[PDB]
Design an enzyme around this catalytic site. Structure first.
Site, PDB file in Angstrom:
ATOM      1  N   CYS A 207      -1.266   0.246   9.522  1.00  0.00           N
ATOM      2  CA  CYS A 207      -0.885  -0.779   8.564  1.00  0.00           C
ATOM      3  C   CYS A 207       0.588  -1.109   8.689  1.00  0.00           C
ATOM      4  CB  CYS A 207      -1.214  -0.328   7.144  1.00  0.00           C
ATOM      5  SG  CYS A 207      -2.899  -0.868   6.700  1.00  0.00           S
TER       6      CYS A 207
ATOM      7  N   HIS B 102       0.812  -1.206   0.000  1.00  0.00           N
ATOM      8  CA  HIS B 102       0.000   0.000   0.000  1.00  0.00           C
ATOM      9  C   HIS B 102       0.849   1.261   0.000  1.00  0.00           C
ATOM     10  CE1 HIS B 102      -3.129   2.889   0.915  1.00  0.00           C
ATOM     11  NE2 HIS B 102      -2.475   3.249   2.009  1.00  0.00           N
TER      12      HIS B 102
ATOM     13  N   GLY C 245      -3.120   4.566   9.885  1.00  0.00           N
ATOM     14  CA  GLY C 245      -1.719   4.520  10.214  1.00  0.00           C
ATOM     15  C   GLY C 245      -1.250   3.163  10.682  1.00  0.00           C
TER      16      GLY C 245
HETATM   17  C1  LIG Z   1     -14.479   1.370  -0.529  1.00  0.00           C
HETATM   18  O1  LIG Z   1     -13.384   1.093   0.302  1.00  0.00           O
HETATM   19  C2  LIG Z   1     -13.655   0.184   1.325  1.00  0.00           C
HETATM   20  C3  LIG Z   1     -14.934  -0.339   1.483  1.00  0.00           C
HETATM   21  C4  LIG Z   1     -15.212  -1.241   2.500  1.00  0.00           C
HETATM   22  C5  LIG Z   1     -14.204  -1.621   3.367  1.00  0.00           C
HETATM   23  C6  LIG Z   1     -12.908  -1.098   3.210  1.00  0.00           C
HETATM   24  N1  LIG Z   1     -11.785  -1.299   3.902  1.00  0.00           N
HETATM   25  C7  LIG Z   1     -10.793  -0.584   3.409  1.00  0.00           C
HETATM   26  C8  LIG Z   1      -9.375  -0.599   3.965  1.00  0.00           C
HETATM   27  O2  LIG Z   1      -9.153  -1.094   5.014  1.00  0.00           O
HETATM   28  N2  LIG Z   1      -8.303  -0.043   3.192  1.00  0.00           N
HETATM   29  C9  LIG Z   1      -6.940  -0.064   3.674  1.00  0.00           C
HETATM   30  C10 LIG Z   1      -6.077   0.414   2.511  1.00  0.00           C
HETATM   31  C11 LIG Z   1      -5.850  -0.733   1.537  1.00  0.00           C
HETATM   32  C12 LIG Z   1      -5.340  -0.176   0.220  1.00  0.00           C
HETATM   33  C13 LIG Z   1      -4.850  -1.735   2.123  1.00  0.00           C
HETATM   34  C14 LIG Z   1      -6.698   0.791   4.935  1.00  0.00           C
HETATM   35  O3  LIG Z   1      -7.267   1.825   5.121  1.00  0.00           O
HETATM   36  N3  LIG Z   1      -5.754   0.334   5.939  1.00  0.00           N
HETATM   37  C15 LIG Z   1      -5.555   1.201   7.093  1.00  0.00           C
HETATM   38  C16 LIG Z   1      -5.905   0.443   8.357  1.00  0.00           C
HETATM   39  C17 LIG Z   1      -7.377   0.685   8.660  1.00  0.00           C
HETATM   40  C18 LIG Z   1      -7.671   2.272   8.871  1.00  0.00           C
HETATM   41  C19 LIG Z   1      -8.809   2.257   9.612  1.00  0.00           C
HETATM   42  N4  LIG Z   1      -8.708   0.966  10.515  1.00  0.00           N
HETATM   43  C20 LIG Z   1      -7.801   0.093   9.847  1.00  0.00           C
HETATM   44  O4  LIG Z   1      -7.492  -0.979  10.231  1.00  0.00           O
HETATM   45  C21 LIG Z   1      -4.105   1.705   7.106  1.00  0.00           C
HETATM   46  O5  LIG Z   1      -3.516   1.795   8.127  1.00  0.00           O
HETATM   47  C22 LIG Z   1      -3.364   2.024   5.788  1.00  0.00           C
HETATM   48  O6  LIG Z   1      -4.067   2.964   5.075  1.00  0.00           O
HETATM   49  P1  LIG Z   1      -3.755   4.499   5.513  1.00  0.00           P
HETATM   50  O7  LIG Z   1      -2.718   4.505   6.609  1.00  0.00           O
HETATM   51  O8  LIG Z   1      -5.020   5.144   6.029  1.00  0.00           O
HETATM   52  O9  LIG Z   1      -3.179   5.178   4.288  1.00  0.00           O
HETATM   53  C23 LIG Z   1     -11.258   0.131   2.309  1.00  0.00           C
HETATM   54  C24 LIG Z   1     -12.626  -0.201   2.200  1.00  0.00           C
END
Ligand SMILES: COc1cccc2[nH]c(C(=O)N[C@@H](CC(C)C)C(=O)N[C@@H](C[C@@H]3CCNC3=O)C(=O)COP(=O)(O)O)cc12
Ligand SMILES: COc1cccc2[nH]c(C(=O)N[C@@H](CC(C)C)C(=O)N[C@@H](C[C@@H]3CCNC3=O)C(=O)COP(=O)(O)O)cc12
Lengths: 297, 299
Positions: free
Chosen positions: A141, A38, A139
C-alpha cells in the site's frame, strides 16, 4: 510487448511510513509525504472511523524514513483516503512533476514497493470499472503509479490502497479520491463488470496489420454510431474518435470502420486461428503504445 | 495473480550512454572508465558481410562520440572482444553500481532496458529461451540496450547487449564478454533459430500458481516421474524438468506433488477444450518459480 517506463526518477521518491506497528509506503515530493490513511488506523476488525483516528493522532507515533535515514514529521493533514505528512527536509531528488487523475482507458506504470523499497515495475491499464490488474501482496500500500510525459515531467496518479475480493487492485490519486470511490475499509465490495476498451482492441488490430496478419480482416465497414450501439450490448466501450487513429490508418490504408466490423465478426471467437499469437481480442495496448513500439513516436 | 514485471531500472539508467562512430549510432553501458557496446557501430555502410578485423584496423578514435545525457566523454582507447567494443574514457562513472558480469543459460529470467540514442524508454522482464533468443520489443537504434538482473544483495548482474532481430521477430544479443548467445553471427545475413521448447520448470510453477488461486479442474491424480516425463518432453516440444524438491514450499501449500503436475502437463498438452487456467487458454511458461513465490509470498 507490455512495458513500463523507467522508474529511477520515482524510486528516489518512495519512503517508509510507520505509525505504531503498521508500515506502508509513501511518496516524498518537496517537503510532503503522501500516503494512505490506512497507516493511522487501529488493529481491529470493525469498520474504521477515520475522523476519530485522525483526532486522537500523535505526531510522535510516526516514523518516516528514506533508505535507513529518518525524516522529522512536522504535521499531518487528512484529504480523503490519504494523509499529507509534512517533513523537515525537502527531497533533493524531487523530479519536475504534476498530479493527474487517471481516466478509464489510460495506461500508466506501477512501481511496486515494500517497506519503502521498490521491488518491481510494470505497466497497467485503468479499466472501465476503475480497477487495475496488478500484482501486490501485504505491504504494497502506497506503491505509486506514474507517467513520464515527453518533456520529462512526471505525472503522479496512483497510490495503492486495496485488493478486491475478485483480485482486482484499487488505489487513489494524490488528492485522496479513491478511483471508482471504493471504500478503504475491510468490507467486500464487488466491482462492476469490465468492458473491453474498444480503443485498445482497434490499436491491436492495426498492429496485426503492420505485422502482416490479415486473415481476420472484414471487407465491409460499420460506422461509429452503429458500432457503439452494438458495443453497449456486447461488453465493449464506445470508440473515441476516428481522427485520432490517423497515423495508423495512413500507414495501413485500412480505416477504423473496417476494424469495427472486424470486431463484430471476431467477437464470436477465432475458430482455432491466432492473431499475433492471441486467441481472443486484445484489450491490452493503447494506440500511443502501439505507435511508440513500431515507430518510436 | 501473476504479473510479468521488471526489476527497478534506476541504477542501470545511470550507465547508459550514446555511442557514435561517424554517422552510425547505438547505445552502451558505462561502468568505471569503460563503455561496452556492439562492434557494429564501427561497421561501414555496405550490404555485404562486414570484415570486422579490417574495420577495427582502420578505426580512428576521433571518429567516436560518447555522451551521457548529452554530456560528452573523451575516448582514450578501444579494444574489440568478440562482438563488442570496450571503449576507455577519460573519466569514471561516479554512479557505477556494484556489479558483476554473468552469462545467461536457457530458462533464465532477466530484465531489458530498451534504449535509443543513449536514453532509456522502456523496461520489461524477459526469459532467455532454449533457442538462445528472447521475445522483446525493439526497433532500429535499440542495439546495445542492456539486459540485467539485481541480486538480493543489491549487485546488478549485467548479462545482455542487444544485437539483432531475426526474420521471425525473435531477438538475439551478446553478453559483456562479447559472445553472442546461441553462436549467432552479428552480420546482415539470414540465420534461422531452432524451434523453441516450452520451459517445463515454469509450467510447473504456473500450474502451482493456479492451484493457490483455486483453479484445479485440470488436476491429475496420476503421477509420472521425472525420468518418464523427460522422455515424453523430448517427443513433444518441452524441456526436461530440472528437479522436484525446489517446489516443496508449493507442494506443501497445495498438497500436490510435482509428479502430478507433470502428468497434468501431458494431460493438458493439446489444449484446454474451451476452459481456461487463470484466464490462459494454453499452458504458460512465462513465470519462473522464483517469480511465482516472490509475487505470491514475498520470498
Ligand atoms: C472483509 O475484508 C475484505 C473483504 C473483501 C475484500 C477486501 N479487500 C481488502 C483490502 O484490500 N484491505 C486493504 C486495507 C484497507 C484498510 C485499505 C489492504 O489489505 N491493502 C493491502 C494491499 C493488499 C494486500 C494483499 N494484496 C493487496 O493489494 C496493504 O498493503 C495495506 O494493508 P496491510 O499492509 O496488510 O496492513 C479487505 C477486504
Ligand atoms: C539484412 O539481413 C537480415 C535479414 C533478415 C533479418 C535480419 N536481421 C538483421 C539485424 O538484426 N541486424 C542488426 C545489425 C547487425 C548487427 C547485423 C540490426 O539491425 N540491429 C538493430 C536492432 C534490430 C532492428 C530491428 N529490430 C531490432 O531488434 C539495432 O540495434 C540498430 O541497428 P541500426 O540502428 O539500424 O544501425 C539483419 C537481417
Amino acid at each position: 510487448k507490455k512495458m513500463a517506463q523507467p522508474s529511477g526518477c520515482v524510486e528516489r521518491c518512495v519512503v517508509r511510513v510507520c505509525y505504531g506497528s503498521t508500515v506502508l509506503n509513501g511518496v516524498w515530493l518537496g517537503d510532503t509525504v503522501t500516503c494512505p490513511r490506512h497507516v493511522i488506523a487501529p488493529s481491529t476488525t470493525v469498520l474504521i472511523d477515520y475522523d476519530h483516528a485522525y483526532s486522537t493522532m500523535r505526531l510522535h507515533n510516526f516514523s518516516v524514513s528514506h533508505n535507513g535515514v529518518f525524516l522529522g514529521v512536522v504535521g499531518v493533514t487528512m484529504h480523503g483516503s490519504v494523509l499529507r505528512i509534512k517533513v523537515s527536509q525537502s527531497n533533493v531528488h524531487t523530479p519536475k512533476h504534476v498530479f493527474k487523475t487517471l481516466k478509464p482507458g489510460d495506461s500508466f506504470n506501477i512501481l511496486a514497493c515494500y517497506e519503502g523499497i521498490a521491488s518491481g515495475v510494470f505497466g497497467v491499464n485503468l479499466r472501465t470499472n476503475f480497477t487495475i490488474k496488478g500484482s501486490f501482496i501485504n505491504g504494497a500500500c502506497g506503491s505509486p503509479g506514474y507517467n513520464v510525459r515527453n518533456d520529462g515531467t512526471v505525472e503522479f496518479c496512483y497510490l495503492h490502497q486495496i485488493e478486491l475480493g475478485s483480485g482486482a487492485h484499487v488505489g487513489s490519486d494524490f488528492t485522496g479520491s479513491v478511483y471508482g470511490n471504493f471504500d478503504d475499509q475491510p468490507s467486500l465490495q464487488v466491482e462492476s463488470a469490465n468492458l473491453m476498451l474498444s480503443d485498445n482492441v482497434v490499436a491491436f488490430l492495426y498492429a496485426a496489420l503492420l505485422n502482416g496478419c490479415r486473415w481476420w480482416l472484414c471487407s465491409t465497414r460499420v460506422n461509429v454510431d452503429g458500432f457503439n450501439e452494438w458495443a453497449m450490448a456486447n461488453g465493449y466501450t464506445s470508440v473515441s474518435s476516428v481522427e485520432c487513429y490517423s497515423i495508423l490508418a495512413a500507414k495501413t490504408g485500412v480505416s477504423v470502420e473496417q476494424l469495427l466490423a472486424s470486431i463484430q465478426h471476431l467477437h464470436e471467437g477465432f475458430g482455432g486461428k491466432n492473431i499475433l499469437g492471441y486467441s481472443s481480442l486484445c484489450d491490452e495496448f493503447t494506440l500511443a503504445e502501439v505507435v511508440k513500439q513500431m515507430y518510436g513516436v
